Paper text:
StnA is an essential enzyme in the Streptonigrin biosynthesis pathway. The crystal structure shows that StnA has an α-helical cap domain positioned atop a common α/β hydrolase domain. The data clearly shows that Ser185-Asp308-His349 constitutes the catalytic triad of StnA.
The S185A complex structure was determined in a different space group P1 with the resolution of 2.90 Å by molecular replacement, using SeMet-StnA as a search model, with 7 molecules in the asymmetric unit. The electron density for the substrate at the binding pocket is clear in every molecule of the asymmetric unit. Substrate 4 (PDB 3-letter-code is STM) perfectly binds into this narrow pocket. Among the four hydrogen bonds, two hydrogen bonds are between the substrate and the main chain amide nitrogen of Ala102 and Leu186 (2.7 Å and 3.1 Å respectively) and play key roles in forming the oxyanion hole. Two additional hydrogen bonds are between the main-chain carbonyl group of Ala282 and the hydroxyl group of ring D, and between the side-chain amide group of Asn277 and the carbonyl group of ring A. Furthermore, there is also a possible π-π stacking interaction between ring A and Phe279. The hydrophobic nature of the binding sites and the aromatic nature of the substrate suggest that the substrate recognition could be predominantly controlled by the shape-complementarity between the substrate and the binding pocket, i.e. hydrophobic interactions. The surface view shows that the binding interaction between STM and StnA is mainly contributed by the cap domain residues. The His349 Nδ1 atom forms a hydrogen bond/salt bridge with Oδ1 (3.2 Å) and Oδ2 (2.7 Å) of Asp308, located between strand β7 and helix αE. The alignment between native and S185A mutant complex was shown in Supplementary Fig. S3. The figure suggests that the catalytic triad is relative stable with small change.
Numbering used by the authors: 61 to 376
The structure:
């Protein structure tokens, strides 16, 4: 009981133009004023935000639709059903302009027909960096949901990704789709378990589904200084939820992102969100880096939902 229409969006790409794939979903028998736009992270695609194994439990999109909200999960360019351009043409700032265009199109009704009054941007990992830049540059979103991306980080976590990297032309899952140039990457088979999820308890079906729905990415975007720039996040003048897993191998550690308690995390990040009228923080126990895909994810889902209800509402 949820209406879902897949569509493509004409999006800026140097000269112009390229195709961004996205799915718009509305709760059955309902027409909400609020849409939540969901930008996935690196090496993932839209499936992260609409996960297809036990969706009742792990699909964040679905949870949102059940809460009354409209949702727009996208395939970032380079991934899934979207255009896969030359890696040189793509970077975070370019990608944020693309997201601005998706927002723009959801507000006016170009995307979806009805046209939404409130737009929420939701971000996972480097999608949160895309989200932040969009929010900072254009100021055309009513609230921002930041996940799996902190201002401090762990070099060794990042290095493990580099030590488990390979080219998507050598990867059995991604071989057949495209001929990717030398600036696209993905992760090795069997590596995600450790490099993202930290070896924490997971459903075996979740790990298998993750490796079967994984994607490529443009790996220069990870080294971008904009990912951790304080100037970007400090400029955000709307309500922000900041979500992080307490065993995230890319952030957490002594002398890095303080994942010892929620209050400590809150303390350490607050100097980076000073224009936000409200700054809320959830810290997900025994969780790695993919928050939607952990066994106690529902704690994270309920909090996110309750926040939305509090800072935007789903309209009428
Ligand atoms: C799913 O998580 C990510 O989007 C992600 N991927 C990665 C990631 C993913 C794939 C790759 C790489 N990094 C990478 O560095 C590299 N050389 C590759 O080539 C093999 C990758 O495929 C990240 N490094 C980072 C990252 C983490 C902390 C701080 C950062 O910058 C200040 C980050 O960019 C993130 C957040």
């Amino acid at each position: 009981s949820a209406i879902c229409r897949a569509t493509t969006v004409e999006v800026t790409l140097g000269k112009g133009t390229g195709k961004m794939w996205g799915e718009l979903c509305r709760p059955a028998g309902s027409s909400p004023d609020t849409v939540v736009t969901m930008v996935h992270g690196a090496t993932y695609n839209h499936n992260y935000w609409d996960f297809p194994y036990q969706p009742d439990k792990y699909s964040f999109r679905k949870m949102l639709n059940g809460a009354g909200y409209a949702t727009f999960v996208v395939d970032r360019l380079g991934t899934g059903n979207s255009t896969v351009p030359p890696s040189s043409e793509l970077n975070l700032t370019v990608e944020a302009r693309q997201m601005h265009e998706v927002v723009q199109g959801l507000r006016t009704g170009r995307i979806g027909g009805t046209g939404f009054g409130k737009v929420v941007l939701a971000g996972y990992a480097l999608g949160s960096a895309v989200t932040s830049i969009e929010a900072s540059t254009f100021h055309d979103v009513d609230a921002v949901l930041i996940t799996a991306l902190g201002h401090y980080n762990n070099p060794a976590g990042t290095q493990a990704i580099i030590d488990n990297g390979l080219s998507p032309n050598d990867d059995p899952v991604l071989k057949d789709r495209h001929h990717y140039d030398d600036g696209y990457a993905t992760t090795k088979p069997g590596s995600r378990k450790h490099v993202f999820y930290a070896d924490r308890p997971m459903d075996p079906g979740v790990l298998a589904t993750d490796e079967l729905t994984k994607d490529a990415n443009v790996f220069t975007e990870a080294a971008d200084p904009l990912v951790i720039d304080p100037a970007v996040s400090r400029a955000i003048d709307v309500p922000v939820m900041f979500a992080l897993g307490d065993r995230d191998p890319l952030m957490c550690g002594d002398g890095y992102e303080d994942c010892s308690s929620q209050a400590a995390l809150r303390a350490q990040e607050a100097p980076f969100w000073t224009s936000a009228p409200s700054f809320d923080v959830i810290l997900v126990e025994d969780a790695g880096h993919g928050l939607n895909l952990v066994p106690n994810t529902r704690v994270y889902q309920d909090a996110s939902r309750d926040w939305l209800d509090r800072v935007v509402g789903h309209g009428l």
